[PDB]
């Protein structure tokens, strides 16, 4: 929500679309696939 550039580089405002919903699903799936490192991957993605 606050950094939509970290979602896609073209977005600049997170949308209420169906492709955005599907990409949120894939994002959540890869985060939960990361397991114990997941908040570490997220806070590294906060930064560069």
């Amino acid at each position: 929500v606050t950094k939509p550039e970290k979602f896609q580089s073209e977005t600049t405002a997170l949308q209420h679309d169906l492709p955005t919903l599907q990409a949120l699903t894939r994002f959540h799936a890869v985060i939960m696939r990361c397991g114990s490192y997941a908040t570490e991957i997220l806070t590294a993605l906060e930064l560069g």
Partner: protein, 48 residues
């Protein structure tokens, strides 16, 4: 064979294994509250 049935048997490959499902308890951080401005009372120390 004479009936059209093969002599060398066919391949039966190994199917995909059942995966292990993964989740993650990702965490956040709200900071501590900033300490307010102190106001001098009119009562002495035991009362207040």
């Amino acid at each position: 064979t004479i009936d059209g049935q093969p002599l060398s048997l066919s391949l039966y490959a190994t199917p995909a294994d059942p995966s292990m499902l993964l989740s993650a308890a990702i965490t956040a951080s709200q900071g501590g509250g900033d300490l307010p401005h102190a106001v001098m009372p009119m009562y002495r120390f035991p009362v207040i």
